[PDB]
Amino acid sequence: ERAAKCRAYAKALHYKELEFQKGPTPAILESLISINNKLQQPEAAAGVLEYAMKHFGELEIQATWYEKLHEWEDALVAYDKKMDTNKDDPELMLGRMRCLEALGEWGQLHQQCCEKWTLVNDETQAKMARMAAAAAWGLGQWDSMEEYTCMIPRDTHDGAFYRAVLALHQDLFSLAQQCIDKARDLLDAELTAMAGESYSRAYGAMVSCHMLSELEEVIQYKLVPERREIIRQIWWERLQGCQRIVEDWQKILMVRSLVVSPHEDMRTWLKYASLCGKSGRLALAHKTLVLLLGVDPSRQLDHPLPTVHPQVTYAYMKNMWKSARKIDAFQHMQHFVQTMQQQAQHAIATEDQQHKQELHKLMARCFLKLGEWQLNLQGINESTIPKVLQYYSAATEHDRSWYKAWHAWAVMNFEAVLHYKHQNQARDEKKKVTEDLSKTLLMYTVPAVQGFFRSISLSRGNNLQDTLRVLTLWFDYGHWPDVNEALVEGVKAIQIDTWLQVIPQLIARIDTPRPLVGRLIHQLLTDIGRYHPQALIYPLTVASKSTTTARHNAANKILKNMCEHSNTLVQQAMMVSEELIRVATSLELQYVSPKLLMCRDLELAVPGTYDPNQPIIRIQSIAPSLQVITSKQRPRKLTLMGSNGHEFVFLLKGHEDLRQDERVMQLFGLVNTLLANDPTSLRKNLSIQRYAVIPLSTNSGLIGWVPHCDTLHALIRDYREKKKILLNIEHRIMLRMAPDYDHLTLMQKVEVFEHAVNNTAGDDLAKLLWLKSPSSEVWFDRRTNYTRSLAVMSMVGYILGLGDRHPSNLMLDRLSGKILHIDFGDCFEVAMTREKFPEKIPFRLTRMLTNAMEVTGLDGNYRITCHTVMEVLREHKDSVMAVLEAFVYDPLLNWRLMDTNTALNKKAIQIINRVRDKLTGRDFSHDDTLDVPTQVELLIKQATSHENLCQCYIGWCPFW
Ligand SMILES: Nc1ncnc2c1ncn2[C@@H]1O[C@H](COP(=O)(O)OP(=O)(O)O)[C@@H](O)[C@H]1O
Ligand SMILES: [Mg+2]
Ligand SMILES: [Mg+2]
């Protein structure tokens, strides 16, 4: 019955949205935020309010708008302006207060309550009490609470609750016991009264039911003394676990405040204060901290800080940094660290070793901020370089383990190198020059290498960035002994696994002209041969049949070496990739390649299915028939049978260098991990459907066939033919109007373009996805999926510079809805830079895409998902840049940038800057460093502009 209630909603939402289509009315708009709420789609509904604002300033008072937008801090200052310019107005005061109770502003909420007590209104008098109870509860003042509670009806969930709290202070446990169960039922029955159309009160019912069950443990915490540890554990664990915006946690802790004071909680409140900063309530976090210190909001500003609680101070100081005062913050840190080593070296009389180590760990985490801040305030130059390296090395000492510490040191060292390499390129633009540079670079290079290595070993699983960074220093440094020793030392130390991530990069340099570099690679690859042969054969096989002599030569030496322990695997894989190149409306295997029909029960793993952790699935049998996909390149629909039993379908492409597609699928892999690790992105299932890419030569290669998918172009062509609509009708429309369309001025083009849109249906996609759906909660979910997955690939695609996104280059999963990108030819601006028909667009946000989303589309799920995704990216911009750098400066893959014709070092540099700009918000204006939502808005604007879409090559179907 539960999953049966949402179906009626989903269906009515469809007609409700189809109604909005016919005419946007505040009547519908109301019934829309409601139904999107019962359907527990908070953001899609938030979108409906965004539209409600930008079209109807009619529910009026910009303070009521900020209040509905849960921007309480904005609505408060808007209500002051609305009260100081107006009068008393009983309504304006209620809001002025609701802001205060949301903000945890008990001081002002209690003052505003008492100092204004004429309140001739009885409803004003009734609401008043609910709030002034919580305000009094926060301020301690329990006499004020019971006064205001004795005004709250015992018929309300609120009235029944506040008694349970007053009983718990006055130690009336049986009273408190019953009041909870009665408040539960007054809330349970209230969740049926407004059964659907409520605020974040359905999600705040969780906040009240959470607190009530917590208040039943605060009950457990009064007479019979056994569970103090058990209760504090569940309190602590279901807090790191729990995730609820500031406001709720205030109240949640206020329940825990009835028993455990902040001074005993300590870690509990610091974790809370930590969130208040990270969310953006510094004024609140400060007060939390001032309380824990038992010392001033440092009103004595010139004075040093209290060392009494080392952790609290560190918190205060990092809050001070994220706050305004940050030369002041830095300063307090230099001194704090100095006070801390003294309080260690001296105060530690052996019998204190736990305190010693935690004091040493806090210090490390202090130094890492010190170096972080020094770089922030000063940048990288001859003065700060040895200072921060000082701070980091010092952090490396006090924690020994800890990824960040070693990582930071490595990067700083690696950027010490870059600083001078780039400073000497500056000099040579206008003998003892190279000698000092040699000593300069060898100075920072070696420790960087060392750092990256001990950083990697502390990262197992997630170390792609650092692993790649090792390879930059490695490959890039035509080897002077010192560097090579550290590299050899690391390779010995670090696990073999590490290197699997990085195999295509290693292979891209088998034929390294530098003598000392080559040797290690070859040796490393051969060890990666002894264990994990499989992750090597396919790529090594390809390399071994290379026109470039030194490649295939060196490639063979390793294959030879691998026969000494895995011969037939090399042998099988040798032949299987040989026959597949030969093969590259149907083809029977018995005519085309008999050796393949011959194959049974091989030990060769099904292309791109090998990974440790997972039982090897091997090619058991190759299906005798391959469909020939009719195209200009006639790809094949090869299909293999697995040693598990499952089938594995592939696309054998003939004249397409699949190596680029590979590094992209790699980049996507990374991006997927990043989104799986940001809480919100994981909360919303944000991902990119990827697929397997197994290059077979420079000509050919295999591609994983994503099941259940049709090109955007397919779904339309079917719908159009079903509904008797001419496939290219917008097209025929344009030419009938303007036979020379392609030659018109921008102004002239826009008209013709607009004409076509105004005389064709923009639903199609939207509409066929409705008919496709077997139900409507399936329909709704498939939409929610589609919307997100697309915004994901919009942002990522932009950073990649992913051009050429026409209706045959993206497709839709007909079972999840999630969108999927294929054909990664045009990467980086490339498509925009071209001579004939330059793409102005950043990513495809065509009309029928916009239209398949919820109405209120771009405001709702899409845009929100856009900054969430873009957010992640800008944070982890270094990892993203490691990958991208790793195939822009890649030797074999530079051929897709000298195509600006139809040395390269200079071009490659730009391409990479261009990406950094995109990840530091300098992608538009040179000088402004635009924040996420702005940049996102700017981009959505750019993707939507008729002036941009009309200029698109007609194939791109800028009207689909
Ligand atoms: N990974 C994939 N999964 C499913 N189908 C695919 C995949 N890659 C390509 N196709 C199909 O092959 C067709 C033509 O190949 P495509 O990749 O578009 O090459 P090109 O860009 O050279 O035409 C596509 O329109 C699509 O139907
Ligand atoms: Mg294509
Ligand atoms: Mg292409």
Side-chain angles (χ1 to χ4, degrees):
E1 280 198 28
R2 283 206 161 194
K5 287 187 181 191
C6 64
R7 200 168 205 152
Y9 293 137
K11 192 165 190 167
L13 172 69
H14 172 79
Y15 298 111
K16 194 65 70 179
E17 282 200 330
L18 206 51
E19 199 175 11
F20 180 94
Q21 286 289 350
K22 309 180 177 199
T25 80
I28 301 157
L29 277 174
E30 184 72 26
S31 49
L32 204 58
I33 13 171
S34 72
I35 183 163
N36 239 298
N37 246 321
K38 324 187 212 180
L39 236 26
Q40 287 167 346
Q41 214 60 42
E43 36 196 70
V48 193
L49 202 75
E50 278 305 302
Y51 184 98
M53 279 197 77
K54 300 164 199 168
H55 294 255
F56 298 93
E58 306 307 283
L59 195 36
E60 71 176 351
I61 313 172
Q62 211 82 6
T64 288
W65 280 135
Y66 294 147
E67 196 176 329
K68 265 139 199 178
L69 288 179
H70 294 265
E71 285 173 29
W72 310 105
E73 240 296 66
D74 295 292
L76 165 80
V77 202
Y79 272 121
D80 296 339
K81 189 97 161 186
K82 194 64 187 164
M83 279 181 74
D84 292 318
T85 317
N86 275 352
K87 330 230 159 198
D88 299 348
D89 315 318
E91 311 133 11
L92 294 183
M93 179 219 51
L94 278 161
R96 210 266 171 188
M97 290 175 72
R98 296 186 221 110
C99 293
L100 297 166
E101 77 160 326
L103 272 157
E105 271 271 331
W106 323 127
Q108 280 189 17
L109 183 62
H110 203 259
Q111 181 203 357
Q112 176 65 47
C113 206
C114 296
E115 265 203 4
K116 329 287 171 186
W117 243 114
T118 308
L119 316 168
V120 198
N121 305 325
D122 211 42
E123 289 180 10
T124 295
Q125 223 249 145
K127 277 281 179 189
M128 195 76 37
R130 163 181 294 103
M131 316 170 72
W137 177 26
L139 282 160
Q141 294 182 305
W142 311 87
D143 297 341
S144 280
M145 173 149 73
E146 205 175 328
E147 279 178 51
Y148 291 121
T149 308
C150 284
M151 307 210 90
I152 318 167
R154 317 195 189 200
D155 298 305
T156 329
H157 143 67
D158 304 64
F161 178 82
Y162 287 112
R163 266 103 182 172
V165 184
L166 277 153
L168 269 159
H169 165 259
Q170 286 160 342
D171 295 304
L172 301 149
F173 320 114
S174 51
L175 261 159
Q177 181 39 60
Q178 292 181 21
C179 285
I180 290 160
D181 309 299
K182 279 163 189 171
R184 277 171 164 177
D185 306 346
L186 295 172
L187 192 64
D188 282 317
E190 175 73 327
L191 291 178
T192 323
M194 40 181 75
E197 304 182 334
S198 68
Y199 317 87
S200 54
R201 209 213 149 162
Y203 199 82
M206 253 238 83
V207 180
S208 271
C209 83
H210 182 77
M211 277 164 74
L212 283 161
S213 38
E214 277 255 304
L215 203 71
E216 278 183 350
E217 298 175 62
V218 162
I219 271 182
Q220 286 175 53
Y221 216 132
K222 291 276 175 178
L223 293 171
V224 281
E226 207 212 87
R227 267 247 214 196
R228 259 154 181 140
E229 287 142 23
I230 317 168
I231 276 186
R232 279 168 185 175
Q233 280 163 42
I234 314 161
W235 279 15
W236 173 248
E237 288 144 28
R238 214 208 317 103
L239 206 73
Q240 281 158 311
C242 271
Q243 278 210 7
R244 323 179 176 217
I245 322 173
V246 211
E247 306 77 12
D248 313 287
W249 278 39
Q250 300 197 60
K251 306 188 158 201
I252 288 158
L253 283 156
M254 279 164 79
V255 170
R256 312 181 178 198
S257 302
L258 287 152
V259 172
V260 194
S261 67
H263 308 277
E264 301 175 69
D265 262 310
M266 281 292 174
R267 66 173 196 211
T268 318
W269 290 78
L270 290 175
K271 169 62 218 154
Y272 159 77
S274 188
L275 283 166
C276 301
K278 288 173 180 181
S279 76
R281 275 209 187 167
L282 299 170
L284 180 61
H286 187 258
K287 263 140 197 171
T288 314
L289 293 161
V290 177
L291 174 80
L292 290 159
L293 268 169
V295 201
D296 269 39
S298 303
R299 284 161 206 158
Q300 289 178 337
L301 237 103
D302 280 343
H303 288 260
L305 308 170
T307 325
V308 280
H309 303 271
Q311 202 74 215
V312 174
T313 313
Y314 174 77
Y316 194 103
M317 310 190 46
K318 60 195 268 168
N319 181 84
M320 181 169 36
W321 175 274
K322 270 189 187 172
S323 194
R325 278 288 216 171
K326 92 168 173 187
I327 306 163
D328 210 347
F330 180 73
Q331 243 293 325
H332 282 290
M333 195 60 78
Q334 305 197 71
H335 287 302
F336 181 86
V337 154
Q338 286 162 22
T339 301
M340 230 39 46
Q341 62 219 3
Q342 275 192 25
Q343 195 188 305
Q345 67 173 328
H346 281 123
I348 296 160
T350 300
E351 282 75 25
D352 233 332
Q353 199 74 329
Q354 283 181 9
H355 191 88
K356 146 128 197 169
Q357 196 176 45
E358 296 145 35
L359 218 73
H360 266 230
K361 279 165 183 157
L362 172 105
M363 281 183 80
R365 298 152 96 203
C366 270
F367 279 111
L368 211 86
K369 293 284 153 188
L370 266 166
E372 212 174 302
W373 296 351
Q374 180 77 273
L375 293 170
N376 183 86
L377 287 145
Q378 310 291 359
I380 298 175
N381 45 59
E382 270 84 326
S383 48
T384 41
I385 283 177
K387 282 187 195 178
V388 289
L389 275 166
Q390 182 49 54
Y391 287 126
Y392 289 152
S393 62
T396 248
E397 300 314 313
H398 298 270
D399 213 299
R400 273 285 141 187
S401 89
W402 188 28
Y403 164 66
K404 259 189 189 172
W406 285 96
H407 175 61
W409 184 63
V411 186
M412 190 29 48
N413 274 297
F414 171 67
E415 290 206 286
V417 158
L418 293 200
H419 179 264
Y420 290 125
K421 163 141 73 198
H422 296 304
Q423 197 194 41
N424 197 29
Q425 284 154 23
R427 314 286 183 167
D428 281 37
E429 202 76 332
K430 274 75 188 174
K431 311 209 166 197
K432 186 83 176 181
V433 193
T434 326
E435 284 179 352
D436 290 53
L437 189 90
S438 297
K439 269 158 185 150
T440 287
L441 302 183
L442 259 165
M443 167 160 62
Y444 303 123
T445 293
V446 161
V449 179
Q450 286 170 17
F452 278 121
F453 270 120
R454 214 170 311 190
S455 89
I456 294 166
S457 58
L458 306 187
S459 315
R460 248 289 189 92
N462 185 203
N463 40 224
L464 176 68
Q465 198 225 329
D466 308 282
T467 302
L468 279 162
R469 280 293 157 224
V470 160
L471 307 191
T472 319
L473 293 162
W474 183 342
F475 301 165
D476 239 64
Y477 284 99
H479 283 299
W480 12 24
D482 310 15
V483 188
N484 203 78
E485 297 175 75
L487 278 153
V488 167
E489 270 324 292
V491 163
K492 287 187 202 175
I494 198 187
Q495 291 280 347
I496 7 78
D497 283 309
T498 311
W499 310 109
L500 302 167
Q501 288 168 0
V502 121
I503 290 174
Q505 281 74 219
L506 290 160
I507 276 168
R509 308 257 179 147
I510 312 164
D511 49 308
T512 291
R514 280 291 182 246
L516 230 56
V517 180
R519 209 165 322 160
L520 220 195
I521 283 167
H522 289 230
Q523 196 237 339
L524 178 60
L525 282 165
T526 321
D527 292 319
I528 300 161
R530 182 183 45 161
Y531 324 104
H532 321 287
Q534 208 86 67
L536 261 187
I537 347 146
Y538 283 113
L540 272 169
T541 291
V542 181
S544 81
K545 37 202 177 191
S546 177
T547 312
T548 141
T549 328
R551 276 203 78 86
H552 87 280
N553 264 5
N556 276 297
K557 292 145 204 159
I558 316 182
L559 292 149
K560 175 75 192 60
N561 250 293
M562 275 172 70
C563 286
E564 284 163 38
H565 65 85
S566 290
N567 180 70
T568 47
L569 221 211
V570 185
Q571 290 317 309
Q572 279 161 41
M574 197 48 69
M575 161 275 224
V576 171
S577 63
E578 275 163 32
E579 287 305 271
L580 283 171
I581 290 163
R582 176 202 311 286
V583 173
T585 47
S586 182
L587 284 179
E588 276 200 344
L589 223 34
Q590 35 149 293
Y591 291 66
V592 179
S593 171
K595 283 195 183 175
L596 288 171
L597 195 34
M598 174 192 88
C599 305
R600 287 285 189 177
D601 310 291
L602 281 42
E603 60 181 63
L604 220 200
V606 183
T609 63
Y610 173 69
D611 74 301
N613 305 334
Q614 302 307 338
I616 297 158
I617 296 140
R618 49 251 311 173
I619 303 156
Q620 178 254 268
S621 173
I622 304 162
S625 279
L626 326 182
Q627 197 216 359
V628 183
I629 298 289
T630 33
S631 182
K632 211 226 166 193
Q633 276 104 241
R634 270 107 41 208
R636 279 74 155 143
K637 199 173 175 171
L638 165 91
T639 157
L640 319 182
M641 182 65 86
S643 56
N644 38 215
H646 288 338
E647 233 131 337
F648 291 84
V649 197
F650 288 76
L651 207 101
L652 180 49
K653 289 188 166 180
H655 351 251
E656 289 167 53
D657 179 53
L658 294 199
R659 287 173 291 146
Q660 307 177 34
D661 279 52
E662 200 201 28
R663 309 298 191 92
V664 166
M665 278 299 154
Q666 188 171 35
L667 161 68
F668 288 172
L670 169 59
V671 170
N672 279 311
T673 317
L674 297 175
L675 296 167
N677 293 310
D678 176 72
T680 342
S681 315
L682 192 64
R683 157 79 183 178
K684 295 189 273 182
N685 269 292
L686 308 180
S687 69
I688 312 159
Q689 266 99 307
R690 37 203 305 267
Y691 52 81
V693 177
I694 340 293
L696 285 176
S697 69
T698 35
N699 264 85
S700 58
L702 290 157
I703 278 147
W705 179 270
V706 188
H708 330 288
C709 292
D710 344 57
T711 47
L712 194 78
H713 181 100
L715 301 138
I716 283 168
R717 178 187 33 71
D718 301 327
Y719 174 85
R720 300 267 252 222
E721 79 184 339
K722 191 198 159 208
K723 298 277 179 166
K724 323 286 178 195
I725 320 162
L726 176 31
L727 178 71
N728 333 287
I729 185 132
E730 302 82 357
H731 204 313
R732 196 187 256 65
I733 282 160
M734 279 157 86
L735 297 166
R736 175 156 277 100
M737 179 166 192
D740 308 296
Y741 178 80
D742 309 274
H743 292 158
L744 296 163
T745 56
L746 180 60
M747 286 277 40
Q748 287 164 335
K749 289 205 182 195
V750 169
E751 185 202 27
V752 179
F753 177 74
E754 278 165 4
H755 177 68
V757 187
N758 303 330
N759 284 300
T760 47
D763 346 286
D764 293 35
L765 182 65
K767 223 157 190 170
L768 66 89
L769 289 179
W770 169 248
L771 305 182
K772 262 174 135 47
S773 67
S775 68
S776 43
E777 71 268 303
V778 163
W779 166 82
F780 180 77
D781 284 318
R782 276 171 179 174
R783 210 178 66 180
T784 311
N785 274 62
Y786 155 76
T787 308
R788 269 168 209 160
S789 59
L790 167 67
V792 178
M793 269 309 299
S794 297
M795 299 296 93
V796 172
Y798 176 57
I799 285 149
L800 182 46
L802 192 65
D804 201 14
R805 304 269 57 83
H806 64 94
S808 272
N809 266 10
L810 58 87
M811 45 187 82
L812 302 171
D813 171 25
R814 81 176 76 98
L815 283 169
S816 77
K818 286 189 182 166
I819 201 159
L820 163 83
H821 286 258
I822 68 154
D823 205 299
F824 303 95
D826 311 22
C827 280
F828 316 108
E829 257 58 303
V830 157
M832 304 177 79
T833 316
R834 81 160 82 108
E835 294 299 280
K836 195 70 170 181
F837 296 130
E839 286 181 20
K840 313 289 163 179
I841 288 307
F843 43 90
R844 110 135 11 193
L845 191 35
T846 200
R847 55 156 184 168
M848 290 173 180
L849 291 207
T850 326
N851 204 98
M853 288 147 67
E854 68 261 18
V855 294
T856 218
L858 315 159
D859 294 331
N861 288 300
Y862 188 96
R863 206 188 238 99
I864 311 153
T865 288
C866 266
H867 4 85
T868 312
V869 168
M870 188 58 68
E871 214 72 60
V872 170
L873 285 139
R874 273 137 138 288
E875 197 206 330
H876 303 301
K877 43 172 284 286
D878 300 56
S879 302
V880 175
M881 289 223 69
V883 169
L884 287 160
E885 282 174 34
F887 77 88
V888 175
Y889 304 119
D890 195 280
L892 325 162
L893 287 164
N894 271 278
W895 77 274
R896 34 109 166 259
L897 337 157
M898 241 207 81
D899 216 347
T900 319
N901 275 352
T902 307
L904 261 166
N905 192 54
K906 210 198 156 209
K907 176 59 186 174
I909 285 157
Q910 312 169 353
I911 291 170
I912 262 149
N913 301 316
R914 223 289 130 151
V915 171
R916 176 145 55 250
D917 297 300
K918 291 186 202 150
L919 292 148
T920 47
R922 293 202 144 168
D923 46 339
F924 288 99
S925 45
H926 34 299
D927 292 1
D928 287 292
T929 301
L930 319 147
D931 77 331
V932 197
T934 297
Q935 177 198 45
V936 168
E937 162 60 343
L938 272 154
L939 281 159
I940 304 172
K941 228 84 272 174
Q942 196 192 314
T944 282
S945 178
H946 281 216
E947 280 183 23
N948 285 328
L949 292 143
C950 61
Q951 303 187 59
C952 290
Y953 172 65
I954 212 88
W956 207 80
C957 300
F959 35 70
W960 278 11

